[PDB]
Amino acid sequence: SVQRQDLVLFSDQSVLPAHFFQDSNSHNLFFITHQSCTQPLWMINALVETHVLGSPSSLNESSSSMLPSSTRSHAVLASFIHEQNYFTNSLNKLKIPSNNYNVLDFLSDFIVNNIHNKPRDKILSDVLAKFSAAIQNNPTDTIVIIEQPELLLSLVSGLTCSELNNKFITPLLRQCKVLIIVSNSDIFNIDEYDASVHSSNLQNFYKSSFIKSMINLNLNPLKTGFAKDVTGSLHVCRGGAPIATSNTSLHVVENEYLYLNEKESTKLFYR
């Protein structure tokens, strides 16, 4: 049949090269966008596994030697749609130690304790303080993953995209090394209807984030007829901002992978 392949991102054949952390005052962003029918659990899990264990052993079927890591290296995960336990259950199948990842809950008791009888500035300041307290204690090696922040625009009323960027996203990115944004692109995929001006304050956030990004990953279903042999198609493409690195020869490689999901296993192959 088809030939199994291995995931690669940059020219040095390293998915998440560690020098990004050694360089001081060089913040970087990742933008993972997906549709509602192509949920990116495996992508996030493989990314965290690569950062901690030093290799994406889940996908590349252990076809490569281990890269030194796990020395106090940490990760912070927060989400506005899954609270704490979903991440824990997903993670506790790859033997990741519990002392290396910290999960923030932004789903339970959020509305009661955050929105009612509080102005918007207070909300944003408190969420920023919660993020800062967590990031403070692990300043050496810590990638920050956050999933669907634009949902906030719905809960808060009178909150605009520019205000969200000014008061939440940019200050958080300024105090981090690698910040990763997980987003759902259902808005752009409504058949027989246009939302270009009918819903623009939502697409503005996506476009701005893509502008401030350096590498883009797209999870889409098949445009052609259904093929049970493969789930969707993952595209890796150049972002919108230069890489804040020192190796001038380090450049992203654009390509695509036909990926098939199974009972907790993803198969990657071109075609």
């Binding site: 192509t38 749609i81 789903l107 009661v112 409504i190």
Partner: protein, 293 residues
């Protein structure tokens, strides 16, 4: 601790091997792939045209919960412990009196019963068994009442039924604001996730008057969605042309599956379009494999 394993209405799933409960319709559970709704999740059954097929499903849910509590009350010669309490967010006070009765006409048992539309459930559910929450009160107050009602029933299975979500005659225009509806749904999802060992959620909506942005927001918020589409003119006429000889072999429309339970959460694309059919019989509502004539 969660629900006691002695409970009869909950069965571990084949795949996830986690607690699961049936919806009262065997076909609906079979379509879901888990032969039931695993505890800690939700489901949405949206509808096309003004037709009102979803009220049957809501009443079936409520009646199944009430029947489980009733057999728990009976507990024939044993200690079954099939406790169940049902909370409905609506204002149609007659809904409680519109639940269909059991069917008494001519493996794991006692899981899912058989219901009759024509008959009526008796006696009427008591106040302690079933409560209603006004959908016009502030969001914070409604969430507080839901939390208190969940806390009071420490060891009872809880079903949260939201019949006819977002109906213009049912809600004021203020509730149509994105903030209010989205915050209410977020709070309900949080409450379901918190006591994931006892609570399940069901709701339905008519998409005829819903803007596509709110539709996609709701689809994202929930756990699973099923789309019901009735047939068109030429379809019905052509089918009646060659099927009126057997008046019991005509469906009402199609069933579409977009978001499934945890299957699609981990990254599986299972969207099936126009491969299932639903037929509402004189006493039962069934779902079968659609086949084009």
């Amino acid at each position: 601790m969660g629900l006691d394993s002695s409970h009869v209405g909950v069965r571990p799933s084949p795949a996830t091997s986690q607690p699961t409960t049936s919806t009262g319709s065997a076909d609906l559970d079979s379509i879901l792939g888990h032969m039931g709704l695993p505890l800690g999740n939700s489901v949405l059954v949206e509808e096309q045209s003004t037709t009102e097929f979803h009220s049957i499903l809501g009443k079936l849910f409520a009646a199944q919960g009430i029947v489980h509590n009733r057999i728990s009350d009976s507990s024939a010669d044993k200690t079954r412990n099939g406790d169940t309490h049902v909370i409905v967010l609506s204002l149609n006070q007659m809904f409680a009196k519109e639940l269909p009765g059991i069917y008494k006409g001519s493996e794991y048992k006692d899981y899912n019963h058989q219901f009759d539309i024509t008959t009526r459930l008796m006696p009427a559910p008591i106040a302690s068994e079933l409560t209603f929450i006004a959908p016009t009160q502030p969001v914070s107050t409604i969430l507080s009442q839901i939390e208190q009602t969940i806390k009071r029933n420490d060891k009872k299975l809880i079903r949260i039924v939201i019949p006819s979500l977002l109906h213009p005659a049912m809600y004021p225009p203020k509730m149509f604001e994105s903030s209010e509806i989205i915050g209410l749904m977020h709070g309900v999802r949080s409450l379901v996730k918190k006591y994931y060992e006892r609570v399940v959620l069901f709701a339905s909506i008519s998409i005829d008057i819903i803007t596509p942005p709110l539709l996609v927001l709701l689809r994202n918020m929930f756990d699973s969605v099923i789309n019901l589409e009735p047939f068109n003119q030429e379809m019905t006429e052509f089918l009646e042309r060659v099927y009126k000889s057997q008046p019991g072999k005509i469906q009402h429309g199609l069933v579409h599956i977009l978001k499934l339970p945890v299957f699609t959460d981990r990254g599986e694309m299972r969207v099936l379009k126009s491969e299932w059919a639903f037929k509402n019989g004189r006493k039962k509502f069934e779902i079968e494999q659609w086949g084009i004539p």
